DNA sequence: GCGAGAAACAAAGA
DNA sequence: CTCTTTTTTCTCG
């Protein structure tokens, strides 16, 4: 998933599991919890949740007064809330189960992963990952982002998907925003204008914003899977189809690794 | 420091 | 059968 997906998960989770107790804590697949699975499960056993955050593309379960579970989804993580009696899936790896129900991660590649730390250790925590400010108009600020990008020679592609300019684009929003910016996937970020650092800017913002209010894009039954989101994508996946504003073929290409979704008319190299 | 390429892993498709 | 394709962080040179 990515940022809006994550965020669409975060409030299905608040709405739902904040004020329960964890009864217990099974895994199938413990390695995946890189504090310690058993360690994990000894200080949250009992615990009830408080609340539920996220910070770029990370989901933060507070629970109890003084924990941070850190859940980070990679490229297909998925949680659903299942009765009790439900059955097994084949790439379910933990559950947090409840007096009436349980939340189970699945994960087919067995990317994600969960870290258990202390409230005071969340700041140090993303500072250390180095991640950037969150896709709002109060968090990122323009001149800085303008700043960055002049001192580099960096494409913009791949720069925006380090998550140190701005937190939460992936594969997909990094190709809608860049060309709804009208901005090629390598272009070098020290030749950008200041227009067009302003349009990038504010790309950035509204359709991260726009994915969130409707509920991520939903691309293939977990949490976060009602989204609406993937009926907007103007290039992502869409190689061969018309672009929509001058309809020339969207065309993909490689990027430092990536497939890349661009219309060649509408985002010059 | 940089960019390239790839690994962690599994499945699906050519 | 092989090769490619689908978030983060590493090694290599
Ligand atoms: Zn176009």
């Not at 998907?161 to 190709?175: K, P, S």
């Not at 800017?201 to 939903?218: T, Y």
């Amino acid at each position: 998933p990515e940022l809006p997906e994550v965020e669409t998960v975060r409030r299905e989770l608040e709405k739902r599991i904040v004020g329960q107790k964890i009864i217990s804590i099974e895994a199938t697949y413990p390695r995946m919890v890189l504090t310690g699975f058993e360690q994990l499960k000894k200080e949250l056993t009992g615990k009830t949740i408080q609340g539920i955050s996220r910070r770029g593309k990370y989901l933060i379960f507070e629970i109890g007064d003084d924990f941070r579970l850190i859940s980070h989804l990679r490229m297909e993580g998925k949680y659903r809330l299942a009765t009790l009696d439900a059955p097994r899936e084949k790439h379910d790896h933990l559950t947090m189960k409840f007096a009436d129900g349980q939340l189970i991660y699945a994960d087919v590649r067995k990317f994600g992963t969960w870290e258990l730390i202390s409230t005071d250790q969340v700041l140090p925590y993303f500072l250390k990952k180095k991640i950037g400010p969150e896709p709002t108009y109060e968090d990122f600020d323009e001149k800085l982002f303008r700043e960055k990008l002049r001192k580099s020679t960096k494409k913009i592609k791949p720069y925006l998907l380090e998550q140190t300019l701005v937190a939460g684009l992936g594969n997909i929003y990094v190709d809608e925003v860049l060309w709804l910016a009208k901005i090629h996937p390598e272009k070098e970020t020290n030749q950008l204008i200041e227009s067009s650092i302003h349009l990038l800017h504010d790309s950035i913002i509204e359709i991260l914003q726009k994915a969130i209010k409707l509920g991520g894009s939903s691309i293939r039954s977990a949490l976060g899977s009602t989204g609406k989101m993937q009926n907007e994508l103007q290039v992502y996946g869409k190689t061969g189809e018309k672009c929509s504003r001058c309809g020339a073929e969207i065309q993909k290409i490689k990027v430092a690794g990536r497939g890349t979704h661009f219309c060649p008319v509408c985002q010059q190299k």
